[PDB]
């Protein structure tokens with residue numbers, strides 16, 4: 429989808445939990461300070477539920493799709509409170525934004 433639409437719409441419904449713009453906080457969502465290529469399951473402070481901690485992926489543009497589509501399914505007991513996003517466009521917009529949020 430669109431990178432800007434991604435970041436806007438992200439911020440609209442995600443930033444509440446995830447202030448990935450600089451140096452927000454964790455606090456009910458880790459600030460997504462470099463996902464793409466970073467081995468999941470190991471955050472140096474707040475490292476989520478064990479269900480996610482145990483996941484040991486590399487938050488790539490596959491795992492991110494499956495998660496954002498169906499996060500409770502992807503991880504059976506994430507502390508993420510999300511269940512659907514819009515339709516489809518957002519799963520393409522968001523996952524365009526974060527693909528450079530990981531590098532701005």
Ligand code: HEC
Pocket residue numbers: 438441442443444445446456457458460463468469475476477478479480487492496503505506507508509510513522
């Ligand atoms: C607060 C109620 C949340 C909202 C709204 C969103 N997310 Fe979230 N997210 C939340 C938690 C508590 C966690 C921790 C993981 C766990 O299972 O315990 C997460 C995690 C993520 C991650 C991965 C974290 C990492 O290992 O880096 C991603 C990629 C992520 N969340 C993305 C994301 C997006 C884009 C959101 C809007 C559509 C969003 N989250 C909202 C809590 C919450």
